[model samples]
Target: RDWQLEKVVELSRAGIRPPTAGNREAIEAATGRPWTEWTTHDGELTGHGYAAVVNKGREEGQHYRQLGLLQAGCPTAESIYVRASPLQRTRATAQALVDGAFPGCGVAIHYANGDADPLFQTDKFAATQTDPARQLAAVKEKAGDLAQRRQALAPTIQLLKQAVCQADKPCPIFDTPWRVEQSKSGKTTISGLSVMANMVETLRLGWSENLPLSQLAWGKIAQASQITALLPLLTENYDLSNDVLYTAQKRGSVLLNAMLDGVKPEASPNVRWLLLVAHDTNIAMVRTLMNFSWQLPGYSRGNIPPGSSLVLERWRDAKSGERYLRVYFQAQGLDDLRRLQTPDAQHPMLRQEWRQPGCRQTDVGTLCPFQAAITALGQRIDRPSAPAVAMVLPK
Candidate 1:
């Protein structure tokens, strides 16, 4: 090791899936990095679930060593962080940070029982609206005007309408309103219809072939809620916050702005660092967190190479005071997602700690772009250690 590089720094993968397919092999093979089963006893620690990007600033220059991350099992992994959103599937989503460096490290978590799917589960499809307010207004209006006449029917109507017609979809019982109309037109030829039609059929049976969406949703709400625990977590933002809606976790790219503005460096004296608030199910939850406008991204670039742990470090200056979270992708099996959405998106999970202004260098108040960070790492100001599956391209 270079005498200058002797100052050992710690980093956090934030949340990782641990070892999988070929992770261990990737870490040992990388020459620049030094992997220890647990030599990091000297490493600074935090509670699991809450990951921190740790590093040491040496007068000689900043060079990162092992990334000390907090495993979800705070007591067991004896790690420093805790799983941010505890029980929600969205709780363990720590993988969306792979593209931060040029050559992404092949580091991945230990595929524990809680491991999630690699590709995102993009079912919240289009952000399109299936009008429920309109349905609610109509239902309520009818109920209000005819309460005396429809008595019992009015109450059932309201309940059924709420179950079916409410703004939230995936009604509890089931989105029962949508019965399968087999078109035989193509694939299953099964046409999806809302639950509303059946309720309408009860009253207006001979009138139309299908019920409106409101009636349809009401029929299924109870059933849907019964079968799936996830139906109730939806937010007005059309996001599954792992029950953590509107917060930094649900913001997506808007998260970038928060990363830029929210991080506070002074949180710790270790100087600049990065951290992500995610957990086990994160890899699979990517789809739940995508923007309806863009094409969904896959578990890409390549695999999270073997053996390596993801690393992100920030390079800083005191005079003019500038800071950049240097991105370094180091992993074996992982591929160059540059073809994807700019490989830079691949590094470590996000760290919003920069919000504590005094710690971070830039008050522009946002996370530095992954590409910019990569440049800093290559220039030697700061370096992150990942699986070694990736490397810095021309940028």
Candidate 2:
């Protein structure tokens, strides 16, 4: 093989989680229906979610080993690094991935413990805070005529209403007009559409959890197509939130810079793999910064599914000694996630290579000159910060 893998960095979305407690009441009230009780607490990863991630991790481990980036057995701590957002879902996801990738290896998952890490929650830090007025303007400009956007989505909204509402009753969520509002705390949100996004996410997670037909969407969503039809709401919400340029630059810069730095041979020369487990918003923002987009099978365009990863691989040409960067988005198929099927020849993980807009494409893949790729990806990063030192979890 002419290409030798030098390093790999993965920014993974945490595995599936139940609807957050903050959203449960509103979602239930809007539908005038009781949501199904989850086996795990609100916003926590479920057992099914954990198992699904483990399957992906195991497949990744085997692939890396075959590529000679990893050895056959347990690796030394210096060779690998794992970090996660401080939340339970992310921390637990980091552990689950390592458990599957390096069973009995005692790999430690690093986190900020009780506090939110700035790498994943940039707005929490003063340096990375965004101007709410600017953010609202950016989102509004990108959204362009909120009323028309809502009207464009009227069919989908009607479909959702029909699925959730009684035939003769009024649905509260649909009646509310969509408007962009900025909170006193500086968070900007769209009133009506954002709530629908939460509903869509809840429905998707419920289906992924393999809930019975009666339990999911009050027995209205009978097939995968029904779930697919609802995903546009989620994608539109993401487009206005994390995918907005100004918002993404403010929120994603720290994490994107860290990922760019981690892939360099000079940074952590001894490390072969770096894994950062975080939320879908983190992944979405970083991908936006890089001007990357994808439409995978069974998902809305640009949707970042739970457990999906945006991967960066650094490779050196053995003959010429030139280094290149290859980037891709990877995830399990919708049905595979729903069934918790381990990725295999019969049902492979969906992987799509993303060529940087200005980069060169070659037979090997989309090969971005390493230094140039770093510059381009990092160009929009605001006040980039040093990577956090990983602390091993207590036994």
Candidate 3:
């Protein structure tokens, strides 16, 4: 907690799961440590990571200097902090922290899905066969063995597996239709890329995995080019209005509240970090939803470039008994929006808004002051300093 890159909270479209556990305080006591104090609580209690951290990386909160539960196993004087990212990234990163704290799982998977069910076979067969019996006949005729046919679709099925949602996460509900499409050949679709559709169909992992949200590959640095790639991963036409952005973000908030719900009043009650990762549009909407005022830069249409992500930190204060959601922006593996060729500086659909009473040039305050003050569960954001993030962190 003493400014040494120990703990952090990141957000984007990553965490997604069912809520079932302890009371808010209990969660804090169990997850947060003894001396996890800070000026975070504006008025609420809670903990954990969510589905939103998918595209966003942990570029913010380095100034806060610690990984949230990343250092859970560390000695009081030697803890290293971290925020939750996308579930995929979270599972990997948390495992690294655990190995650093304990022994390694001895398994690092670059390819997550190699075995899974056929999600599109029935449709593809139906398209050509016209009859279910004919489809089965064709399958039998082609492979001469059901097992062989299944084996033939192995790679495709694996893509479906990787597309499954991670368990017990904070994936949000959307108001629009998030579609999933299928193609047969490399020429029919983008090469080596079906993981993008999984945005709406994320795979759920076991809580026994002990992974939070931030470490996953959810949130983004709108400033990062690689971060923008997350969008095309699912669909080349995928953009901000793609409903997945809003739904994932809302669910991210829900998962966070639920995580707090897991903790009890008597638990640690210490502040925990959260993170999400979606797309540039989702990042922009979240900044808008949280009432963040990222539009005042006086540039062209305010929009996320790539690799640049929105940063958010939540915590509570024992001294003042307050809660806060500290928000900021950071650039990562992407270009500078300030220097982009646009003019309005505001996101695609977002309009202009001003900061409220006390935020004093704040992100959340500019977007939703009342919520930030009352419902944010405790939020306090510092100013954005010169921020930059490499595409990859040093191992």
Candidate 4:
């Protein structure tokens, strides 16, 4: 009885999810991403699920090596650093990546205390909402009241409800008023029709067996659109004074400094592969501080998936001796991501080169001149917070 209860508690805390085919062009035109979605390891370290995810990373590291990453600091495959958050998944990911790259190289995974580590410090800089009350009011003003949110999301809600209902007995779908229920894990406040709708989509993602790519894509687009649609409105309404932009800069600079450290001359020669397996927020701020963005497949440019990663490679031009930055966003297909053991596996891992906003020095492939980038945007890092703007102008 105790064992069962403990297992339930664990699962509730660690919530967790793939895709599809169609008129690919039409879907791409409609969703702004390709419809040819592939499956990936959405489970724990089951079967080749662990292998597949790590293989994707291994393949990525290989691609960089082939693209002349070897000519830079590390100079070889074995000379790299592999570190991840203390989280099990991240630890597993780092282990898998190193295993794939070096096979029996026996490279060990290392961790930096997420709470205190400078490399993982992103929240320290995202300064608190100057006025939680005022921010909430502004959010409601722009995002519409609760009623509007429920209404705006109704169409999506209906589809999710239908999907959950169709599942056979032992179905975990909720009831009206969202069946405010509890498992051995304690209170599951995941209720309300509209809220349950999103939950149903998540359930489908993880537990839906043999769902087609197109159907999965629809759910993804629907869920993503709902969340993305709400952002700009809040951003426009709340940051009327451009305070948020500077705030992000202030908060994101910590990681920015850490990243630049890896590329500078003072970095260890023994460290070749610099790996950071952290959260989406870490990537977001780092990406933002660098002024980099891109059109990714089946997702928003600003969106970062749970296991997704951003790679930053430092380069020294053999000819000009100028250093540069090459950034890439890596994502694996939802299908076959679990089965990929070898780097040659069929998982459609995408490694898209991201272009920075204020960079043009092409000393390397899509490489931004390091010094120039710092010159242009370095000031944005670690800035002091600006004074709060008045909620309303004085009469």
Per-candidate TM vs. native? 0.24, 0.94, 0.32, 0.58
* CA shift of 393, model 1, Å: 38
- lDDT digits (tens) for residues 1-395 of candidate 3: 32112123343322223222222233223223121122222111111222122122222222123334433222332232233233343344333332323332242211113221011111122211123343223322332343433344455443333323234442222111222223333111111222223331121211111223332222212223223323233332222222223322332233223222322222222333322233343444345445454432322233342233454434343344444434555431112222221212332212243335554343233322323443443232111210111211122
Candidate 4 TM-score, true structure as reference: 0.58
The reply for model 4, stretches above 4 Å from the true place, is 1-49, 64-78, 113-118, 121-154, 165-251, 268-270, 336-348, 356-364, 375-380, 383-395
Angstrom error of the Cα, residue 248, model 4: value is 4.5
Answer with 3 or 4, whichever has the higher lDDT.
4
The segments of candidate 3 whose C-alpha lies over 4 angstroms from its true place after superposition are 1-8, 12-62, 65-271, 275-285, 293-308, 315-321, 333-355, 360-395
Is candidate 1 or 4 superior in TM-score?
4
Q: Model 1: runs farther than 4 Å from truth?
A: 1-251, 254-258, 262-274, 277-312, 318-321, 330-395
Ranking by TM-score: 2, 4, 3, 1
| Best model per TM-score | 2
Poorest lDDT segment (10 consecutive residues) of candidate 3:
114-123
Q: Please give, for residues 222-304, the per-residue lDDT of candidate 1 as tens digits.
A: 23222122111111101111111121122222222222222224332122233333321232122122211111122222112
Q: How far is each candidate from the true structure, as Cα RMSD in Å?
A: 21.6, 2.2, 20.6, 14.2
Error (Å) of candidate 2 at residue 84 is 0.6
Which 10 consecutive residues of model 4 have the lowest summed lDDT?
A: 4-13
Count backbone clashes in candidate 2: 0
- For candidate 1, the 10 contiguous residues with the lowest summed lDDT are 385-394
Predictions ranked by lDDT, top down? 2, 4, 3, 1
Q: What is the total number of backbone clashes in candidate 1? A: 115
